[PDB]
Design a protein around this ligand. Structure first.
Ligand SMILES: C/C(=C\c1csc(C)n1)[C@@H]1C[C@@H]2O[C@@H]2CCC[C@H](C)[C@H](O)[C@@H](C)C(=O)C(C)(C)[C@@H](O)CC(=O)O1
Ligand SMILES: Nc1nc2c(ncn2[C@@H]2O[C@H](COP(=O)(O)OP(=O)(O)OP(=O)(O)O)[C@@H](O)[C@H]2O)c(=O)[nH]1
Ligand SMILES: Nc1nc2c(ncn2[C@@H]2O[C@H](COP(=O)(O)OP(=O)(O)O)[C@@H](O)[C@H]2O)c(=O)[nH]1
Lengths: 426, 412
């Protein structure tokens, strides 16, 4: 089976450039060279992310879109940058803005019919594709409405395949934008009902989890868009190795999304460690299952400890005892039964791959579908009502051909999403 | 005279790859030194592929190794209807191909595992397609029953309930085998807290390399599969016994095996070696099937029981005066050269049918309620082509397997 990535926008082209900088190394795949893989296994299931053209030369099966060259060139004229075929790029010299309405209408559109054309050239790659990987941010522009216009047009041609997304929801404290809430609400409006799995990422948490779980002093984005990559990595790809009980986006969505809402998640890593300082790391399963469920170390600033759990799905990887996994995932389920919902007798959906992170023994990607993501899906929504009762930057959207009802729509759409989420946290 | 084996879903292809590993092992014939007699199937490659890419890879013809490049996905309704069909008729073909290829076969051994995808729903329409193409034969299947707590998939119950019901009315006998129950033996009767799946399946091949292999051998009173169900299953219900074993010894904690026929026989009926977490918390065996193999004498066996029995707190059904279809092979076990099974001269395989599974059935069913009571993952099925009925029925169905596995017994 094969998956296809679509890094949309600077952010996504930034997050991706770091994702493909992890899923790459994890396969021993130099900038454009080849399978200089340490293992002889890091290359049989690559048909999940790569393609086979110049034989020795692979092509990460993913497209990159945008509307302000200033970032894509950063990528390609940068490190790993060169390895994705040229055409594999899509963008415009148009006014990117931070207008969702511009990425999903006046401009974002006139770029999709060429981005859609691209993807299929890949969708028609070969064998049964599993689904799509779309990384982006819900507060900027070329990624929010521009992405949304895609996942909502991708389904139009792939109603079968599974719809993924590691959407960067606006951090709880400091937005790197102004019209944060706008691009947001308007964005998920499309995801909440075009995706079937969405790992919400908080640019802040990744800070908290880099300054406190680690003790890094100048945490730049390269670190951040790593961190993400780890989980984003684990979940998919990684899961397509030999597993003493392997899983994949299918079974994940099939175990991770109770009701149709596609529902959004929260990635968590387990073996995070403080630089050369923390050697230690006896790394068992309880210390791996220890981190994961911890009230911090979770990518979204939401508090797992602030709402129940629908279906946790810790993905293990690195030769270990099932006997303890269950035990460990059991004792965390019991000694902590408080946040695990009773209408799902056995939430946890264990998965134990075999090969682990290169210089690592045991790992534990996480994917909780807690009713704690109602803490942000509320957040990014309360900020909206605000700037709307004063029709704030409304005219950067309108002017770009839009409506005052669509802002009503999207919100109310993305608003009950908090409601149906409260319909289980209780 | 021949027994066909079917191995489906990771479990199925797993548990089995371990029973089919001790097999040749105790038949002195290395990796490629005759030919097997089964057929593996999945709708998610990698697992099956993890066979045909390693040990034993060459002890099976790629024809048998049916495999699907679709998406297994832990939803019953996808392995049965939607995608299972995409490869099923192809399997029926393989099987028949193996069916006609012999001198009057017997039954089938469908190793799989309830709580999953390909093993749950798929097998379901394998057995249906079997039992109505072989009514004149027997259909035994190893029901790896979804653990009582230490689970995995979120749907676990859904899959099962539907699977068991759409199979019951087909197979003739289902040997339950729990995952935890075993664990709770690899820490008690083996002293190892690193029990990998590779071990839980080796302990299956230790209770499987009997029921058949053994039986099919010469000794005291040979026991075919036919005798099993004829002596093991009281009524039409494909009644599902719960495999057991007594010489369950820690090949480094118990420095003693010379533990005479009696003592092991006592072990079997202890609610510890049970392969299923179905502690006889009421259960009244309706018909055990103690299978001795090796250095066991027809009078020592015919004595260990004339007390296991008169132990009374052993409590046997009312209606069954002598429920002990004994079996006695000549060859003892043949432990994996480096496993943890100290290996011994004698060994039972006690695979009884007790008013015990009446338990897990219940719990593993009550889980179904809580879920289905909110539909939970339901759509993940209906989309795959299903109706609110299936779930409805495959429940009312169980309701009966309740109003039956408690009825027949409990009352005298
Ligand atoms: C320079 C490093 C990471 C990094 C810095 S900027 C970027 C994109 N990546 C190093 C080395 C890389 O991590 C790879 C090998 C070591 C993996 C270990 C399992 C490690 O213990 C891991 C859990 C870590 O400690 C982190 C990678 C999270 C980090 O704290 C240490 C680090 O800087 O790794
Ligand atoms: N004893 C034992 N139990 C296993 C093994 N592998 C899996 N199980 C358990 O049996 C359950 C059902 O088997 P699965 O392998 O999940 O089923 P499946 O057919 O693979 O499901 P899909 O992959 O969706 O098709 C699993 O959820 C585990 O709890 C194994 O090798 N031995
Ligand atoms: N983790 C992460 N977040 C980023 C990065 N760059 C920008 N962001 C986030 O994305 C938001 C802006 O989205 P962006 O994609 O740059 O806007 P766009 O180019 O118009 O779509 C900012 O407010 C940040 O929260 C990055 O490299 N990594």
């Amino acid at each position: 089976r094969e998956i296809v990535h679509i890094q949309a926008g600077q952010c996504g082209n930034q997050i991706g450039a770091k994702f493909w900088e992890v899923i790459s190394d994890e396969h021993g795949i130099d900038p454009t060279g080849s399978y200089h893989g340490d293992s002889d296994l890091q290359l049989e299931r690559i048909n999940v992310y790569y393609n086979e053209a110049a034989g020795n030369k692979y092509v990460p099966r993913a497209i990159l879109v945008d509307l302000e060259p200033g970032t894509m060139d950063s990528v390609r004229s940068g490190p790993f940058g060169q390895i994705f075929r040229p055409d594999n790029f899509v963008f415009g010299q148009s006014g990117a803005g931070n207008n969702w309405a511009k990425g999903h209408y006046t401009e974002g559109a006139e770029l999709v019919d060429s981005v859609l054309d691209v993807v299929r050239k890949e969708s028609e790659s070969c064998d049964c594709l599993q689904g799509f990987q779309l990384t982006h941010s819900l507060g900027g522009g070329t990624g929010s409405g521009m992405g949304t216009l895609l996942i909502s047009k991708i389904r139009e041609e792939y109603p079968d395949r599974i719809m993924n997304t590691f959407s960067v929801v606006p951090s709880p404290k400091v937005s790197d934008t102004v019209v944060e809430p706008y691009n947001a609400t308007l964005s998920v409006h499309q995801l909440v009902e075009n995706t079937d799995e969405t790992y919400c990422i908080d640019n802040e948490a990744l800070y908290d989890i880099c300054f406190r779980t680690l003790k890094l002093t100048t945490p730049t984005y390269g670190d951040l868009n790593h961190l993400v990559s780890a989980t984003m990595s684990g979940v998919t790809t990684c899961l397509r190795f030999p597993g003493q009980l392997n899983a994949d986006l299918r079974k994940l969505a099939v175990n991770m999304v109770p009701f149709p809402r596609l529902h959004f998640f929260m990635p968590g890593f387990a073996p995070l460690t403080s630089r050369g300082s923390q050697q230690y790391r006896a790394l068992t399963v309880p210390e791996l299952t220890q981190q994961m469920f911890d009230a911090k170390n979770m990518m979204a600033a939401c508090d797992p400890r602030h709402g129940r759990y629908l279906t946790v799905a810790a993905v293990f990887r690195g030769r270990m005892s099932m006997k303890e996994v269950d035990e460990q995932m059991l004792n965390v389920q019991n000694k902590n039964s408080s946040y695990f919902v009773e209408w799902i007798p056995n939430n946890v959906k264990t998965a134990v791959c075999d090969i682990p992170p290169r210089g690592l023994k045991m790992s534990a990607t996480f994917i909780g579908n807690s009713t704690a993501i109602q803490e942000l899906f509320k957040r990014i929504s309360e900020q909206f009502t605000a700037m709307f009762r004063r029709k704030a930057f409304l005219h950067w959207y309108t002017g770009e051909g839009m409506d005052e009802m669509e802002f009503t729509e999207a919100e109310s759409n993305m608003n009950d999403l908090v409601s149906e989420y409260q319909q289980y946290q209780d | 005279r021949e027994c066909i084996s079917i191995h489906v879903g990771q479990a199925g292809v797993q548990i089995g790859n371990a029973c089919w590993e001790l097999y040749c092992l105790e038949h002195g014939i290395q990796p490629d030194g005759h030919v097997p007699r089964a057929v593996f199937v999945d709708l998610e490659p990698t697992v099956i592929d993890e066979v045909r890419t390693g040990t034993y890879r060459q002890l099976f013809h790629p024809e048998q190794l049916i495999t699907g490049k679709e998406d297994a996905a832990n939803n019953y309704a996808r392995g049965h209807y939607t995608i299972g069909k995409e490869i099923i008729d192809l399997v029926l073909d393989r099987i028949r191909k193996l069916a006609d290829q012999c001198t009057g076969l017997q039954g089938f051994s469908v190793f799989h595992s309830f709580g999953g995808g390909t093993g749950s729903g798929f097998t379901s329409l394998l057995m249906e397609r079997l039992s109505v193409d072989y009514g004149k034969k027997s259909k035994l299947e190893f029901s790896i029953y979804p653990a009582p707590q230490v689970s995995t998939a979120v749907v676990e119950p859904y899959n099962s309930i539907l699977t068991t019901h759409t199979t019951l009315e087909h197979s003739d006998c289902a040997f339950m085998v729990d995952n935890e129950a075993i664990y709770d033996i690899c820490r008690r009767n083996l002293d190892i807290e690193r029990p990998t799946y590779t071990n839980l399946n080796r302990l299956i091949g230790q209770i499987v390399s009997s029921i058949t292999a053994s039986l099919r051998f010469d000794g005291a009173l040979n026991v075919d599969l036919t005798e099993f169900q004829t002596n093991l299953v009281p009524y039409p219900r494909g009644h599902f016994p719960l495999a057991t074993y007594a010489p369950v010894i820690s090949a480094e904690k118990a420095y003693h095996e010379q533990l005479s026929v009696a003592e092991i026989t006592n072990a079997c009926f202890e609610p510890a070696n049970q392969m299923v977490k179905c502690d006889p918390r009421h259960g009244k065996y309706m018909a055990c099937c103690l299978l001795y193999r090796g250095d066991v004498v027809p009078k020592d066996v015919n004595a260990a029981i004339a007390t296991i029995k008169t132990k009374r707190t052993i409590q046997f059904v009312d209606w069954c005066p002598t429920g002990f279809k004994v079996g006695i092979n000549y060859e003892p076990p043949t432990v994996v050269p480096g496993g943890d099974l100290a290996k011994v001269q004698r060994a039972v395989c006690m695979l009884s049918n007790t008013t015990a599974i009446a338990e897990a059935w219940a719990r593993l069913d009550h889980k179904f309620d809580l879920m289905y009571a909110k539909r939970a993952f339901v759509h993940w099925y209906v989309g795959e082509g299903m109706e609110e009925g299936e779930f409805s029925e495959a429940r009312e169905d169980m309701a009966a397997l309740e109003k039956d596995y408690e009825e027949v017994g409990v009352d005298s």
